[PDB]
Amino acid sequence: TVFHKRYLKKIRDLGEGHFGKVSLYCYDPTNDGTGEMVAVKALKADAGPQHRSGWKQEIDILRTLYHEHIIKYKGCCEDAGAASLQLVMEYVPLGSLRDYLPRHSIGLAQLLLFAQQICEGMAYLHAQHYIHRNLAARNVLLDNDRLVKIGDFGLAKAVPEGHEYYRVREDGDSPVFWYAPECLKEYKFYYASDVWSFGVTLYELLTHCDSSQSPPTKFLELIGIAQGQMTVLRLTELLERGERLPRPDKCPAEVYHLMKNCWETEASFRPTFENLIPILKTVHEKYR
Ligand SMILES: O=C(Nc1ccnc(NC(=O)C2CC2)c1)c1c(Cl)cccc1Cl
Numbered sequence: 519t520v521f522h523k524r525y526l527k528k529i530r531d532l533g534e535g536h537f538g539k540v541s542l543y544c545y546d547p548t549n550d551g552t553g554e555m556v557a558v559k560a561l562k563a564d565a566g567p568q569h570r571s572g573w574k575q576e577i578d579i580l581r582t583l584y585h586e587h588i589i590k591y592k593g594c595c596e597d598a599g600a601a602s603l604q605l606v607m608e609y610v611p612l613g614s615l616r617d618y619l620p621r622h623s624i625g626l627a628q629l630l631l632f633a634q635q636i637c638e639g640m641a642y643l644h645a646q647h648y649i650h651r652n653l654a655a656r657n658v659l660l661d662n663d664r665l666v667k668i669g670d671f672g673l674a675k676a677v678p679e680g681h682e683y684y685r686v687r688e689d690g691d692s693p694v695f696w697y698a699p700e701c702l703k704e705y706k707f708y709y710a711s712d713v714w715s716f717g718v719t720l721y722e723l724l725t726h727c728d729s730s731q732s733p734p735t736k737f738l739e740l741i742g743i744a745q746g747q748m749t750v751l752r753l754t755e756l757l758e759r760g761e762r763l764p765r766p767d768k769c770p771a772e773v774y775h776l777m778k779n780c781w782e783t784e785a786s787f788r789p790t791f792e793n794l795i796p797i798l799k800t801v802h803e804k805y806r
Contacts, residue, residue: 519593536672587639610659717780
């Protein structure tokens with residue numbers, strides 16, 4: 519599928535992804551303003567060959583994914599400037615849970631439904647042999663009060679069939695506060711590492727993405743802000759000691775224990791996304 523840049527009318531900027539900026543455009547070939555609203559992700563023109571090969575990998579990944587809880591790929595646009603492809607995706611109207619939750623008080627049952635849907639989309643992703651590596655409330659988009667979709671595949675990687683993990687690089691942009699200890703210490707990302715990040719995302723939802731309760735805020739309160747190059751080492755050490763993010767206010771005790779089970783230090787003790795689906799369905803039913 520191909521979109522022409524001459525019909526793309528920029529409305530506003532939506533934010534910054536991993537490889538570049540996301541903008542909202544009206545794709546209007548008739549010029550009558552009745553065209554579809556689309557989210558367009560672009561690679562910064564100044565980016566090097568490392569970001570360029572990774573950007574092409576992200577497009578390749580999103581083009582192959584098709585799920586009700588995964589942002590819909592619409593096509594690509596020939597960017598004459600930057601000499602690359604612009605990723606055309608569906609506009610998800612309510613935006614990210616990070617932006618939405620602080621301004622709209624959502625009930626516990628609805629948050630658990632969002633958690634269930636995240637697990638459904640993540641179970642499909644893992645079945646396709648991919649790891650997400652950036653599962654956070656910031657990357658979860660809300661279509662309506664009852665539908666959520668996973669976004670930003672900028673860190674997503676293919677896991678070979680014979681392998682259970684992918685070896686990661688020492689990176690400044692890594693979302694360390696959403697990462698399992700095996701990622702921080704051994705630079706290995708397992709399917710089970712995405713489950714750890716889900717536990718963190720669930721914590722975020724239960725706090726209504728309150729910035730004063732965010733994973734960086736809480737972990738840095740424990741680590742301190744004057745630790746030289748040792749923030750990650752101190753994070754690794756507290757996690758190994760069994761320290762964890764606290765129970766969000768009004769989060770049921772059993773839901774917090776499910777969260778802590780996503781945060782097992784031993785990756786094999788964590789549930790898979792497939793195990794989480796029937797559990798979250800039952801928990802959502804109890805609270806609805
Ligand atoms: O792709 C993103 N956001 C989208 C996509 C589609 N539609 C929307 N919709 C809106 O932003 C609505 C609120 C105006 C946002 C996005 C950005 Cl910009 C930064 C980090 C992570 C992610 Cl996933």
